[PDB]
Amino acid sequence: NLTIHNIENYENDPQLRLIPWILWENLFQHFISANELSLMTLSYKEAIHIFLPGTKNMEQVRQLLCLYYAHYNRNAKQLWSDAHKKGIKSEVICFVAAITGCSSALDTLCLLSDEIVKQAENYQAFRLAAENGHLHVLNRLCELAPTEIMAMIQAENYHAFRLAAENGHLHVLNRLCELAPTEATAMIQAENYYAFRWAAVGRGHHNVINFLLDCPVMLAYAEIHEFEYGEKYVNPFIARHVNRLKEMHDAFKLSNPDGVFDLVTKSECLQGFYMLRNLIRRNDEVLLDDIRFLLSIPGIKALAPTATIPGDANELLRLALRLGNQGACALLLSIPSVLALTK
């Protein structure tokens, strides 16, 4: 048959080029069978005239995709119906729906309880949609299978979330956390923080990272990895948040003269802690001002003597001496709580 790795020798093929380059490498493995290329060069009615399906899932998938990218636009608006006929598994069409993002495909299988079953390949359709960022397909699955949404999310070690994150699909990420907030912290931690590690490679997907860092445990892990993150992500994020706080504080000591300097919820408070930990971890004179300012908040100051590791105590103070961050120490021992537990 034929095999292409040379991109220039791929866009020269009037037919093959119709297939997304990414797919041709991740699904077709740079090679195309003869019983499949046929379905792309001959007319549509001819391709089906011959179209003999396969027994193994991937067989059909690679085929159905060849017909789609070559005829779907050309009156083959009913290729999903004919497919079902000839011999394409009801689930294979559901995969090509989650991959191509074609709703029309799902619309057909949605007019035949045999849908709340086609869970196929451990919710592979749900996972394929997340990796391709097809939010609309993802939702249709949650619409055609309410009592299953939670298994799809946690399917394969929160795969959906992870695949979404490494591809930069922040919109697929948001929704996923809306579908079940009780799994947020989970998905983020899944597989030793898969999401963050892969959204950070290369040029990186800053939309995912910045979002991900709104999770105290996430920022906790990332901020300590100064080499991998920091100059690129953490630092700009901390500088961007320390300044945002100075603009709600001053904008309170304006509207509510001489009152409180607080963070409403527990979550924003924990963030300040690790945000402060990083500033100290960096050990720098120019960062002294942001440290004092963070400790001025009762939602952070009343979190200075604590520690991430249960059973331990003064972490920040320990970290300060550990690095030799004099000035951060003096600033810390100024807190009564931290003044008590002191040796």
TrEMBL record:
This is Ankyrin repeat family protein. SUPFAM superfamilies: Pseudo ankyrin repeat-like (SSF140860). The gene is legA1. It comes from Legionella pneumophila subsp. pneumophila (strain Philadelphia 1 / ATCC 33152 / DSM 7513).
